[PDB]
Amino acid sequence: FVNQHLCGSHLVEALYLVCGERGFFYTPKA
């Protein structure tokens, strides 16, 4: 695999791909 530059919705897509059925938490900074 390679390193990633992921902003906005592109990060959510990557989390979905990586975690799939396990699910994930998307937890930005306040």
Closest CA to 8 of 22, 23, 26: 26
- CB of residue 29 vs other proteins: minimum separation in angstroms? 5
CA pair distance 4, 22, nearest whole angstrom = 21
Q: What is the DSSP letter of 14?
A: H
- CB of residue 30 vs other proteins: minimum separation in angstroms? 10
- CB of residue 21 vs other proteins: minimum separation in angstroms? 9
Residues that bind other proteins (CB under 8 A): 1-8, 11, 14-15, 17-19, 22-29
